[PDB]
């Protein structure tokens, strides 16, 4: 449907985000049968929302549990005559909500919010019970996809194809918000600029039988433009347009009035224009250079759960290190991260949860794009995730790119058949932004067959790590050669969205061999040397802020160790190399082929 | 091995030089002092010694050199130069005259230098050491080159390819009647020990004592020697003086020997007619800073750790150890499975190339010959040791392609004919289970390497227990042979802890070593356990090695992980030489 983030005005929120819900497992799938919605928690225990249920009890048998978990919470209802709505900003994978024995709504998104209108079903003044059924399972039509395997005892074991651990549960806000019966439930805003001198910001919104008078107030509450109608444009003059450095943000207050009731919604948008020209990524008609991380929503104890201290601290670290950009790696991030990126002018490459469409990253199906794995319904679900992501992050000026999928195996015939309609559909959904598909390493420029449909070429390369293990002299030649081959092929702006190596924070060696910090430094350094002599490399993005948790494997030593920082946010030796490089260059500009 | 009744030339430092342009043999570098040399220490691998990244991985020709004074007291005696071990290949020159060469690596080679040496004046010694491996070296490998002539060596074993001079170099003197060859075989029923001898212009008079010069038998001849009437606890060993008499000079050579006879009966390993149970480690010749170089301090300390942790046996894993380890081994009476450098005969161990392992371009002809040679030398050096109870021809070979059996049968035959007094084995890899292995019948004891719960069924104890159990008792029902598990271990970061007891944590090494021990306890054919590696050790660079192999109970600087005390409780809590009665 339509997605508007709620905000306090003559509108109200009761943060049911309160922790300490009742939590229980359903190892027998008796919950849907035995009507657990009715009343009690049976044999529950205290859990905390937001937060992943896997790491929260230090029980291994819970963290690998694959099935149905039950959340439970009684709450009181203060808003009368207002539309009361129950919003879940994120319930990872599947969630079915119940308000006092009655199914309200359900979702199969994972990292996208879903809400429901509960005005008839509640009465402001008495209690009410909310029971959530959260499913953490992945089959071939989920985004991301997976394979759940039962064995001889019927015990479910979830296997997937991405790297990060499949943290599940309620990860973001659960809120009970309250809006007048004539609401402003959808908005779209597109901005243009000409020579940083003047241009318009077209408006568009959806009401509940009310008219929309829209004003454009300033950063100090000064009206600069008005407008009367459901559509149309409106022009500023000599704007304070949104730059990657500062990030100026106008406050467009929209009004939807009825003959009796009225609703006012303030929506912050910044004037900026993002486009791709040849091999240049232009923000406000200036060629840009991306620097920063591909991070994860990962932490100790809470898993993929959200928390504010992590936001302010992580943004302080990136702010110190000189990073100006990041990419919401492998799933839509919490909207709060994108609000911060909006105010602080942080350019973001947004991505969907489509990751793992690849069976070469080592009882696996034998054809990746057959009916037994990634079929038409996988394509429908992928288009769904695109729809929801764009419908949530469409107005945020910090998003400059949509990324449909991550590292798909494109060698087999049919990858183009699967991905081309999704490129067409995404271009038809949001024309204001470039589109991309992050490229796997074993699909170099001479075997890929998908990168033509996208505006920006994103690359994940690990020459010298997975291949040429320990060889810098050779990985330099290979890396430079394939980079110039991508240039000779597509003449596109090339952002390296992943490049990193594993490093035991504390492992040193005089020989600068793999897994030591000296190898991380020398490796990133050589990669930077190659980066500086390719004209079409419009951005670099290291593989990963900090070490994150992965599934158990013989390649993951307590998870992925390719982070610049540790899981507790401590810098390895390479963090200060990146400090020197990024903070030493001119902001938003590519190095002049050398310092 | 020399004694007397010498000047150990390995003292101090040698001149060391690299040959990147490969000019040495052509420009005759041995006939002069090494131009642009630097000090190097023997014994010790040259790779780790200088903290130089380029020196560590260098593949080519290296040059050692050292002047020495030949003592005046050796006027009319034969002067012999002995290299206890020069890893992979070595060509030795003595003062403008080429004396010797050897492609062994982990076994000694000596040469008579009496003419080329005049005792009293200083002579120079130049050694050319090669660290290259092709398909005819033991272990095998293959070198690759490109533009700029940069040579890059790739091999198929795990441990890092350390090279150089790894053990002492001796310069011993014997009278002109020497005892070049000696053999001794001991028997025991419910006995004695035949003697042997090879000499030049000298007769053989053999006597043997016990504690001190207290002869308790004698014999005059090159056969028989039987008379009056060695344990894994203490290790009682008699002293056998051999005498070679000539008209002018006489020679006396003392050889310690322990009375013992090893034999396999059904599914039991009998040392002195008693069922045994193997406990201990499969270790390595690896250390901080010195590579595979030998050192007495390390031997004393590691033997202290093995004594404390309750180990009674170990296997000289993947190459012949320094013979000092075996002298200590029969001194304190620790059971040793001796093994050749035959490792890496497998193309299936891929971190994630010819087309068939037993083709002509890889493993055929000189490969089989030189393997038989590594056998002949290992046996010709370690035959008399009572601590050696087992022969081990090869380790983890791929026996699935066509032609593996045709390869391994003749080696088993010749090796058995060479030393019939000891059982023989071949440690097979994990990818070849009971239904696919085709060689385990040729050998007396079957050796197993198993990693259920690590490489396959990664992190799942509940099923790896079943697979290990089924595979084990299926082996037992299949061949009805004694099965020693010679490798079972999992990697572990020394300081990584985890409440969930998942992989790489010490809790997972503890819980993973435990389940394997219960499945061990419910199987009658398992005649021993040897946790994979004693200490973490250096390997080649891969994405599966976090600064080497972390499958050690101890770290590289010999510091214990959480499993060291678990195993010290298990091995010393049971009775010595006995297996638990299924619990
Ligand atoms: C057959 C050739 C394979 C080439 C190597 C592919 C490496 C893919 C790297 C992986 N790319 C995806 C990212 O989420 C992971 O964290 C990253 C990693 O594992 O470090
Ligand atoms: C089904 C087989 C899956 C792969 C099993 C690989 C077992 C190889 C055993 C290897 N054997 C050689 C030894 O030096 C090494 O330490 C050990 C290892 O892995 O580290």
State which of A245, A274, A303 marks the end of a domain.
Answer: A274
Residues of B in contact with A152 (CB under 8 A): none
Distance from the Cα of A547 to chain B's closest Cα (Å) equals 14
Closest CA to B25 of B90, B105, B69: B90
Residues of B in contact with A504 (CB under 8 A): 493, 546-547
For position A222, which CATH number holds?
2.60.40.10
| Beta carbon pairs, A and B, within 8 Å | 64
Same domain for B228 and B127, yes or no, is no
Separation CA B426–CA B404 (nearest Å): 13
Same domain for A175 and A41, yes or no, is yes
CA B424 to chain centre: 15
Distance from the Cα of B145 to chain A's closest Cα (Å) equals 13
Ligand at minimal distance from the CA of A464 is: 1
Q: Is the CB of B306 under 6 A from ligand 2?
A: no
Q: Determination method here?
A: X-ray
**A228-241 burial string, b = 16+ CB within 10 Å, else e?**
eeeeeebebeebeb
Separation CA B281–CA B529 (nearest Å): 8
Same domain for B444 and B479, yes or no, is yes
Q: Give the CA-trace dihedral at B429, B433, B436, B442, to 10 degrees.
A: 70
Separation CA B507–CA B505 (nearest Å): 5
State which of B245, B262, B279 marks the end of a domain.
Answer: B262
Give residue B352 CA to ligand 2 midpoint distance, Å. 13
Asked whether the bond before B43 is cis by omega within 30 degrees of 0, the reply is: yes
Q: Which of B451, B467, B503, B548 to mutate to test the pocket of ligand 2 (most atoms within 8 A of CB)?
A: B451
Give Dmax over CA atoms of chain A in angstroms.
Answer: 78
Whether A122 maps to a domain, the answer reads yes
* Index of the ligand 1 atom closest to the CA of residue A442: 2
Q: State the DSSP H helix or E strand holding residue A578, giving kind and residue range, or none if neither.
A: helix A574-584
Phi, psi for residue A547 in degrees, rounded to 5: -55, 140
Which residue of chain B is at minimal alpha-carbon distance from A511? B53
Whether B433 maps to a domain, the answer reads yes
Which residue of chain A is at minimal alpha-carbon distance from B500? A60
Give residue A498 CA to ligand 1 midpoint distance, Å. 9
Give residue B357 CA to ligand 2 midpoint distance, Å. 18
Separation CA B544–CA B549 (nearest Å): 8
Q: How many CB atoms lie within 10 A of CB B510?
A: 18
Separation CA B23–CA B410 (nearest Å): 41
> Nearest Cβ partner of B541 from A59, A469, A555?
A469
> Nearest Cβ partner of A558 from B454, B458, B504?
B504
Cβ atoms of residues A253 and A264 within 8 Å: yes
Interface of B with A (CB under 8 A): 51-53, 56, 351-352, 454-455, 458-459, 463, 491, 493, 496, 498-505, 541-544, 546-547
Give whole-number Cα distances, A427 to A330, A387, A390, in Å.
20, 11, 11
Binding pocket residue ranges, ligand 1, CB within 6 Å: A 163, 360, 407, 441-442, 460, 462, 466, 498, 543, 560, 562
Whether B579 maps to a domain, the answer reads no
Residue by residue, DSSP assigns B450-477 as --BTTTBSTT-HHHHHHHHHHHHHHHHH
Q: Which residue has the tokens 């394509």?
A: A379
Q: Give the CA-trace dihedral at A355, A358, A359, A364, to 10 degrees.
A: 50
Residues of A in contact with B459 (CB under 8 A): 552
Cβ atoms of residues A527 and A498 within 8 Å: no
Tokens representing B238?
């008699």
* Index of the ligand 2 atom closest to the CA of residue B449: 9
Separation CA B488–CA B84 (nearest Å): 32
Residues of A in contact with B161 (CB under 8 A): none
- Catalytic entry in A115, A297, A388, A407: A407
For position A571, which CATH number holds?
3.20.20.80
Cβ atoms of residues A304 and A329 within 8 Å: no
* Index of the ligand 1 atom closest to the CA of residue A555: 19
Q: Is the CB of B534 under 6 A from ligand 2?
A: no
Q: Is the CB of B491 under 6 A from ligand 2?
A: no
Whether B2 maps to a domain, the answer reads no
Give whole-number Cα distances, A374 to A241, A384, B156, B292, in Å.
43, 14, 38, 53
Please list the active-site residues of B: 396, 487
Interface of A with B (CB under 8 A): 58-60, 63, 151, 362, 465-466, 469-470, 502, 504, 507, 509-516, 552-555, 557-558
Same domain for A481 and A459, yes or no, is yes
Same domain for B94 and B140, yes or no, is yes
Q: Give the CA-trace dihedral at B545, B551, B554, B555, to 10 degrees.
A: 0
Same domain for A125 and A53, yes or no, is yes
Phi, psi for residue A88 in degrees, rounded to 5: -110, 110
Whether B200 maps to a domain, the answer reads yes
Give residue B430 CA to ligand 2 midpoint distance, Å. 7
Nearest residue by C-alpha to atom 13 in ligand 2: B158
Same domain for B165 and B305, yes or no, is no
For position B19, which CATH number holds?
2.60.120.260
Separation CA B547–CA A324 (nearest Å): 34
Cβ distance of A552 and B459 shorter than 8 Å: yes
- Spatial CB neighbours of B454, under 8 Å, sequence gap ≥ 6: A554, B490, B491, B503, B512
According to DSSP, the β-strands at B141-144 and B13-19 are unpaired
Tokens representing B243?
């005498």
Whether A591 maps to a domain, the answer reads no
Q: Which of B45, B351, B456, B547 to mutate to test the interface with A (most CBs of A within 10 A)?
A: B547
> Nearest Cβ partner of A554 from B53, B455, B500?
B455
What are the beta bridge partners of residue A148?
A158
- E strands along B396-546, which residues? 424-428, 445-449, 483-488, 526-531, 533-535
Tokens representing B120?
């009293």
Residues of B in contact with A558 (CB under 8 A): 493, 496, 498, 504-505
Cβ distance of A557 and B455 shorter than 8 Å: no
CA B195 to chain centre: 26
Separation CA B515–CA A89 (nearest Å): 44
Q: Which residue has the tokens 């790894």?
A: B166
Same domain for B436 and B359, yes or no, is yes
Cβ distance of A504 and B459 shorter than 8 Å: no
Residues of A in contact with B351 (CB under 8 A): 469
Cβ distance of B458 and A511 shorter than 8 Å: no
Which residue of chain A is at minimal alpha-carbon distance from B147? A474
B428: helix, strand or coil: strand
Same domain for A67 and A159, yes or no, is yes
Whether B582 maps to a domain, the answer reads no
Cβ distance of A553 and B458 shorter than 8 Å: yes
Separation CA B508–CA A458 (nearest Å): 39
Residues of A in contact with B53 (CB under 8 A): 510-513
| Number of domains chain A is built from | 3
Distance from the Cα of A295 to chain B's closest Cα (Å) equals 22
Structural domain harbouring B196: 179-262
Closest CA to B498 of B489, B488, B509: B509
B158: helix, strand or coil: coil
Same domain for B164 and B244, yes or no, is no
Whether A391 maps to a domain, the answer reads yes
Nearest residue by C-alpha to atom 6 in ligand 1: A441
Q: How many CB atoms lie within 10 A of CB A179?
A: 25
Cβ distance of B547 and A510 shorter than 8 Å: no
Same domain for B229 and B139, yes or no, is no
Give whole-number Cα distances, A1 to A114, A173, A206, A384, A389, in Å.
9, 19, 11, 11, 12
Q: Which of B351, B455, B531 to mutate to test the pocket of ligand 2 (most atoms within 8 A of CB)?
A: B455
Which residue of chain B is at minimal alpha-carbon distance from A513? B541
Resolution of the experimental model, in Å, one decimal: 3.2
State which of A153, A179, A205 marks the end of a domain.
Answer: A179
Residue A586 is given by DSSP the state P
Query: Is A407 considered catalytic here?
Result: yes
Closest CA to B389 of B526, B295, B528, B524: B528
Same domain for A233 and A362, yes or no, is no
CA A129 to chain centre: 31
Ligand at minimal distance from the CA of B546 is: 2
- Determine whether B328 is exposed, middle or buried from the number of CB atoms within 10 Å of its CB (0-12, 13-18, 19+): middle
Distance from the Cα of B409 to chain A's closest Cα (Å) equals 35
Ligand at minimal distance from the CA of A443 is: 1
Q: How many CB atoms lie within 10 A of CB A584?
A: 10
Give whole-number Cα distances, B484 to B313, B450, B528, B552, in Å.
12, 11, 5, 19
A156: helix, strand or coil: strand
Region at A183 (left for phi over 0; alpha for psi -120 to 50; beta for the rest): beta
End-to-end Cα spacing for chain B: 44
């Amino acid at each position: 449907s339509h997605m508007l983030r709620p905000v306090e005005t003559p509108t109200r929120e009761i943060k049911k985000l309160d922790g300490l819900w009742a939590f229980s497992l359903d190892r027998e799938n008796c919950g849907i049968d035995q009507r657990w919605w009715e009343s009690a928690l049976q044999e529950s225990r205290a859990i905390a929302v937001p937060g992943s249920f896997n790491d929260q009890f230090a029980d291994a048998d819970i963290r690998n549990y694959a099935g149905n978990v039950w959340y439970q919470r009684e709450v009181f209802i203060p808003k009368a005559g207002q539309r009361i709505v129950l919003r879940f900003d994120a319930v990872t994978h599947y969630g079915k909500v119940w308000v006092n024995n009655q199914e309200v709504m359900e979702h199969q998104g994972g990292y996208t919010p879903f809400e429901a209108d509960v005005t008839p079903y509640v009465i402001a003044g008495k209690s009410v019970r909310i029971t959530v059924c959260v499913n953490n399972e992945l089959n071939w039509q989920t985004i991301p996809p997976g394979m759940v395997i039962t064995d001889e005892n019927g015990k479910k074991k979830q296997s997937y194809f991405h790297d990060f651990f499949n943290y599940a549960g309620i990860h973001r806000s659960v809120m009970l918000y309250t809006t007048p019966n004539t609401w402003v439930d959808d908005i779209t805003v597109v901005t243009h600029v000409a020579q940083d001198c003047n241009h318009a910001s077209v408006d568009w919104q959806v009401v509940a039988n009310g008219d929309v008078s829209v004003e454009l107030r300033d950063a100090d509450q000064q009206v600069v433009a008005t407008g009367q109608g459901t559509s149309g444009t409106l022009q500023v003059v000599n704007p304070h347009l949104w730059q990657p450095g500062e990030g100026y943000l106008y406050e467009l207050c929209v009004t939807a009035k009825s003959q009796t009731e009225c609703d006012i919604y303030p929506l912050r948008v910044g004037i900026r224009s993002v486009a791709v020209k040849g091999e240049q990524f232009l923000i406000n008609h200036k060629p840009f250079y991306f620097t920063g991380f591909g991070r994860h929503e990962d932490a100790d104890l809470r898993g993929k759960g959200f928390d504010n201290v992590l936001m302010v601290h992580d943004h302080a670290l990136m702010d110190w290190i000189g990073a100006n950009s990041y990419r919401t790696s492998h799933y839509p991030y919490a909207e709060e991260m994108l609000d911060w990126a909006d105010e602080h002018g942080i350019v973001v490459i947004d991505e969907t949860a489509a990751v793992g469409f690849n069976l070469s990253l080592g009882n696996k199906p034998k054809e990746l794009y057959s009916e037994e794995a990634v079929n038409g319904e996988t394509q429908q679900a992928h288009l769904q995730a695109i729809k929801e992501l764009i419908a949530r992050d469409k107005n945020h000026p910090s998003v400059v790119m949509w990324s449909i999928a991550n590292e798909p195996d494109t060698r087999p015939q049919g990858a183009r058949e699967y991905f081309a309609p999704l490129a067409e559909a995404t271009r038809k959904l949001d024309p204001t932004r470039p589109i991309t598909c992050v490229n796997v390493m074993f699909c170099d420029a001479h075997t890929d067959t998908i990168s033509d449909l996208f505006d920006v070429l994103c690359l994940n390369r690990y020459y010298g790590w997975y291949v040429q293990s320990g060889d810098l002299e050779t990985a330099e030649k290979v890396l430079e050669k394939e980079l110039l081959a991508w240039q000779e092929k597509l003449h596109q702006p090339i952002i390296i969205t992943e490049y990193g190596v594993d490093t035991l924070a504390g492992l040193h060696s005089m020989y600068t061999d793999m897994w030591s910090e000296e190898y991380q430094c020398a490796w990133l350094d050589m990669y930077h040397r190659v980066f500086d002599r390719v004209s079409a490399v419009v951005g670099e993005q290291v593989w990963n802020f900090a070490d994150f948790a992965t599934s158990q494997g013989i390649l993951r030593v307590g998870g992925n160790k390719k982070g610049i920082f540790t899981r507790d946010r401590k810098p390895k030796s390479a963090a200060f190399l990146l400090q020197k490089r990024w903070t030493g260059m001119n902001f938003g500009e590519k190095p002049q082929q050398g310092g």
